[PDB]
Design a protein around this nucleic acid. Structure first.
Ligand code: XG4
Ligand code: MG
Ligand code: MG
Length: 430
DNA sequence: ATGATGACGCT
DNA sequence: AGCGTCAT
């Protein structure tokens, strides 16, 4: 009772851009705005692979990983923007630049953890404390939370979405105990006020809309964010967790979407996150290991301790290209030319990184995939990254992988390569 | 024939 | 050091 931690010590938010690459293209080309629209990579094979989809197009069944030709069958008037192609590969520079726009704005409110090209966590615990003491003790008006959902409300004793949102928010605010600065529900609420302000600033200064989750930890914040996309934010209180998790498939929890989540389901014979509470910590540790067991024991109770890391920049800079089926690289000269293309993009991004961020990469990781191998990587080799020079980087990459070539002859490569991947790592201050 | 490519755990 | 997992 008095000694059992409830995991309510922090206020954490996750902000994620709505259909991000689509919004980047819609900002640039007004003709695409408020329309079913998707962003695709390449064009020749089946119209291009879709990697982002406007909410208007999602209503037709268009999804990520769909070929554009197939999406067009679902949505004949679907509009398409293609990712820039440079040196024969996809070039995502425009979206990396848009990302920096958003991250730099979020950084004004608190130190962020950049978690992807379009989302960041923020620890608002301190900001919340300062806002609480400076609002004197005033109650929090619903007007300060104009796009906020309270997960689980309304409950108990309007048939349209906005009406439901407000009734839930009203129930929540009417119940708040604003006289107690230590109340976690209050801290979350103030967090939500701050996130409304953050999201307003993002939209005002970039034109991009986003959604957000506010909770006590990263996993719940991320989950909350998704509950009411697009252009809304969701507060998941500690109190909301039992009902929320009681019907929540285990795979919806980040890190559980793969084989670990599958084994939890199979070994324990359960479906929902809440069902995990039945097991002792030792029981979970026995099935899934010490780290996973402890994590699962706490997580099914809404508790997680992973900190928001002070990290606004990516830890690695990399680029890759697949060469599927018949396009697999089967000659020495081919392998070298594409290593050079990848290396040239990497040099330009590295040089820009050094100027912007006062750091230099010191290690180069070369990854390949061979024909027949379904793994992401068949083989990885590293070498020193001592100069931002594409010819040197590509030559060095060839050197460390050249012995994979089981060909007898000079100019051929066997088995043919279905992927090349250069990744610059181990940054140092410069 | 998804693709591009990013974080991070394990040994 | 190099491989596996999860992600989208
Ligand atoms: N090259 C590449 N880019 C991708 C891929 N998957 C996603 N992206 C790019 C494209 C995405 O726009 C962007 C952000 O990914 P999300 O936040 O997971 N999806 P979004 O923001 O589109 O929609 P919403 O968040 O509203 O559900 O990352 C991929 O497989 N490959
Ligand atoms: Mg997004
Ligand atoms: Mg995202």
């Amino acid at each position: 009772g008095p000694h059992m931690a409830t995991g309510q010590d922090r206020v954490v938010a996750l902000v994620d851009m709505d259909c991000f690459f689509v919004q980047v293209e819609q900002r640039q080309n007004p003709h695409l705005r408020n329309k079913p629209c998707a962003v695709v990579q390449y064009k020749s094979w089946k119209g291009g692979g879709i990697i982002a989809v406007s909410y208007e197009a999602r209503a037709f069944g268009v999804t990520r990983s769909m070929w554009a030709d197939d999406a067009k069958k679902l949505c004949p008037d679907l509009l398409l923007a293609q990712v820039r192609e440079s040196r024969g590969k996809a070039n995502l520079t425009k979206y990396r630049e848009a990302s920096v726009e958003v991250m730099e704005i979020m950084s004004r409110f608190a130190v962020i953890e950049r978690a992807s090209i379009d989302e960041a966590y923020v620890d608002l615990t301190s900001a919340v404390q300062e806002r609480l003491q400076k609002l004197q003790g005033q109650p929090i008006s619903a007007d300060l939370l104009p796009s906020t959902y309270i997960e689980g409300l309304p409950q108990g004793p309007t048939v349209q979405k906005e009406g439901m949102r407000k009734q839930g928010l009203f129930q929540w605010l009417d119940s708040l105990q604003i006289d107690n600065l230590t109340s976690p529900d209050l801290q979350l609420t103030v967090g939500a006020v701050i996130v409304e302000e953050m999201r307003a600033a993002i939209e005002r200064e970039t034109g991009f809309q986003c959604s957000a989750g506010i909770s006590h930890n990263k996993v719940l914040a991320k989950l909350a964010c998704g509950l009411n996309k697009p252009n809304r934010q969701t507060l998941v209180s500690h109190g909301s967790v039992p009902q929320l998790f009681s019907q929540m498939p285990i795979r919806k929890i980040r890190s559980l979407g793969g084989k670990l989540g599958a084994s939890v389901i199979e070994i324990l014979g359960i479906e929902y996150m809440g069902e995990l509470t039945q097991f002792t910590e030792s029981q979970l540790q026995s099935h899934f290991g010490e780290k996973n067991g402890s994590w699962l024991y706490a997580m099914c109770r809404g508790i997680e301790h992973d900190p928001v890391k002070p990290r606004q920049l990516p830890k690695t800079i990399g680029c890759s290209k697949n060469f599927p089926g018949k396009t697999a690289l089967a000659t020495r000269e081919q392998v070298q030319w594409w290593l050079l293309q990848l290396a040239q993009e990497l040099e330009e991004r590295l040089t820009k990184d050094r100027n912007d961020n006062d750091r230099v990469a010191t290690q180069l990781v070369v990854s390949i995939r061979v024909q027949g191998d379904k793994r992401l990587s068949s083989l990885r080799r590293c070498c020193a990254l001592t100069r931002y020079d594409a010819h040197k980087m590509s030559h060095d990459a060839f050197t460390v992988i050249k012995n994979c070539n089981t060909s007898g002859i000079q100019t051929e490569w066997s088995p043919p390569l279905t992927m090349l991947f250069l990744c610059a790592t181990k940054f140092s201050a410069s």
